[PDB]
Amino acid sequence: GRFSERAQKVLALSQEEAIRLSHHNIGTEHILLGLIREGEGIAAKALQQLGLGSDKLQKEVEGLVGKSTPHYTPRAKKVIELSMDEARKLGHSYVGTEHILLGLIREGEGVAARVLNNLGVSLNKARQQVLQLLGNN
Secondary structure (H helix, E strand, O other): OOEOHHHHHHHHHHHHHHHHOOOOEEOHHHHHHHHHHHOOOHHHHHHHHOOOOHHHHHHHHHHHHOOOOOEEOHHHHHHHHHHHHHHHHOOOOOEOHHHHHHHHHHHOOOHHHHHHHHOOOOHHHHHHHHHHHHHOO
C-alpha cells in the first residue's frame, strides 16, 4: 500500500538485519529488529518503553534462530498486509511504524512473537503500549 517515510526506513532496516544474520528470508523477527533499530518512530518508542533494547532483542533473536536475494517469508508478507488494516482502523491512509508493529502483534505467530514471549511481553500488553503512545497528548 502506502508507507510513511519512517515505515520505509523500517523495511530497509528489516532487510539489512536479515542479511546481517545470514538469512535469505526476511522474517517477522527481522521486521521486529527493524522496528527497534529505526529508533525514533512510535514503534521503537513503544518497544523502548516496554524495556526492550536493540542489543537485547538482537541477542534474543540470534538465540531462537541461529544465524542470494532476500525475500519476505509468507508471515512477514502477512504482517505487512495487516499493517495496512491496522492503519486504516486508526484513521491513517499511510502505514506508519506503529502499524507495522500492530500488524506484527495481530499476526501473533512466528519468530517475532516467540521472541516477545521469551522476553515476557504479552501481545496484549504490546498493543496497549502502542495505543497508549498514540492516544498520548
